[PDB]
Write a protein that binds this DNA or RNA. Structure first.
Ligand SMILES: Nc1nc2c(ncn2[C@H]2C[C@H](O)[C@@H](COP(=O)(O)OP(=O)(O)OP(=O)(O)O)O2)c(=O)[nH]1
Ligand SMILES: [Mn+2]
Ligand SMILES: [Mn+2]
Length: 425
DNA sequence: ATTATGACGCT
């Protein structure tokens, strides 16, 4: 009862740019705006692989990881923007720079953890306390939440539903209690409306967000009402929400561990997890996963919002699938050099912007017919930002994989260089 | 022949 802590101490938001690469291209090219459009990498093989899809295009069934020539069968008016190609490979620089614009705006409101190029987590606990003191008991007006959904409401036209649910939530609110978790979430949501307004003002990019008490629920909330909307998932809404939530929808359960939860326990939905003791879950899935699942099915998660706005590694990768697999020494060298040249560019810019140097170079390759995604991963020292040296060292470090007697065998289907182990410079 | 990344856990 009174001692069962409920994981309601924090206010955490997950902000996610809607179809981010598409929006970046649509800011740059107005002819793409408010159209079915997608972003592709390469164009020769089946029109190129799609990596981002506007919501208008998604309404036709266009999805990520789909060939453009197939998407065009579903959506013949689909517009396509192409990823920049440099030194023979995809170059994602435009989107990393757009991402940094967005991150820098979010950082003005709270500390953020960059979770990927287009999404960050936000720790709003301090910001909400400050704002709750600034209101001095003043109640929260629906006008402050023009794009917010309250999950699970209303109970007992899309925008009409949204406003009814918001009204129920606000009427149920105890504004005099500066320590009510639900009030904290509500104020967090007001701040997130402001953050999203600033992001759109200052970049033109729209985003969705989730507001809850931890990262997993913030992330799950964010996806309930997309695009250009934010969803508040309260502690009290967890039992109903989870009672029909497929386990795979929860961050980190979408793969093998989630599948084994489903198969071993004989369940489908997140809420069924509550029926097992912590020890049972630890027995099936290990001590960490067990504790995490026992708390998470009750809506409780303690993973902190790490104050990290910048990537921890800087990486360059290219697949060589099918018959393009690299089969000679000259080929492997030239592509290691192209990779090392892009990496050198990104690293020098990183050192100038962010006052840090990487110290370790990781070289990963795949060989043809290998089942694994990394056939080999080996590290060496990274002592100067010079593409020729980095490529020479990556070769030095992988060359004993060649089993030929000038040739390369098994041919390589992936090269990958990653600078890691940053130190302040 | 979804591809390009990037975080993080296990050992
Ligand atoms: N190169 C590459 N980029 C990817 C891949 N998956 C996603 N991206 C890029 C394009 C996406 O716009 C961006 C962020 O991914 P998300 O899962 O958040 O989807 P996106 O923002 O496109 O749409 P959303 O509104 O979040 O449903 O990262 C991939 O497999 N390869
Ligand atoms: Mn997104
Ligand atoms: Mn995302």
């Amino acid at each position: 009862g009174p001692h069962m802590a409920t994981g309601q101490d924090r206010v955490v938001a997950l902000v996610d740019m809607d179809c981010f690469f598409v929006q970046v291209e649509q800011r740059q090219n107005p002819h793409l705006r408010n159209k079915p459009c997608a972003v592709v990498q390469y164009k020769s093989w089946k029109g190129g692989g799609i990596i981002a899809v506007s919501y208008e295009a998604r309404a036709f069934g266009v999805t990520r990881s789909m060939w453009a020539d197939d998407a065009k069968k579903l959506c013949p008016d689909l517009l396509l923007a192409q990823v920049r190609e440099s030194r023979g490979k995809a170059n994602l620089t435009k989107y990393r720079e757009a991402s940094v614009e967005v991150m820098e705006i979010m950082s003005r409101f709270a500390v953020i953890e960059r979770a990927s190029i287009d999404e960050a987590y936000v720790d709003l606990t301090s910001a909400v306390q400050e704002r709750l003191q600034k209101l001095q008991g003043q109640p929260i007006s629906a006008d402050l939440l023009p794009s917010t959904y309250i999950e699970g409401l209303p109970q007992g036209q899309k925008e009409g539903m949204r406003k009814q649910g918001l009204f129920q939530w606000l009427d149920s609110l105890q504004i005099d209690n500066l320590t009510s978790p639900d009030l904290q979430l509500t104020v967090g949501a007001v701040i997130v409306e402001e953050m999203r307004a600033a992001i759109e003002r200052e970049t033109g990019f729209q985003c969705s967000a989730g507001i809850s008490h931890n990262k997993v629920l913030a992330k799950l909330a964010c996806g309930l009402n997309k695009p250009n909307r934010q969803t508040l998932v309260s502690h009290g809404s967890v039992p109903q929400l989870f009672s029909q939530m497929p386990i795979r929808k929860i961050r980190s359960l979408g793969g093998k561990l989630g599948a084994s939860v489903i198969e071993i326990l004989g369940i489908e939905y997140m809420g069924e997890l509550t029926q097992f003791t912590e020890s049972q879950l630890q027995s099936h899935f290990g001590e960490k996963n067990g504790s995490w699942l026992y708390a998470m099915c009750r809506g409780i998660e303690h993973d902190p919002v790490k104050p990290r706005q910048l990537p921890k590694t800087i990486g360059c990768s290219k697949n060589f699938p099918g018959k393009t697999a690299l089969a000679t020494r000259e080929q492997v060298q030239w592509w290691l050099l192209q990779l090392a040249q892009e990496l050198e560019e990104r690293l020098t810019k990183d050192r100038n912007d962010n006052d840090r140097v990487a110290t370790q170079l990781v070289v990963s390759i795949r060989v043809q017919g290998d089942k694994r995604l990394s056939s080999l991963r080996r590290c060496c020292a990274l002592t100067r930002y010079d593409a020729h040296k980095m490529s020479h060292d990556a070769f030095t470090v992988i060359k004993n994989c060649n089993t030929s007697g000038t040739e390369w065998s098994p041919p390589l289907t992936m090269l990958f260089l990653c600078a890691t182990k940053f130190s302040a410079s």
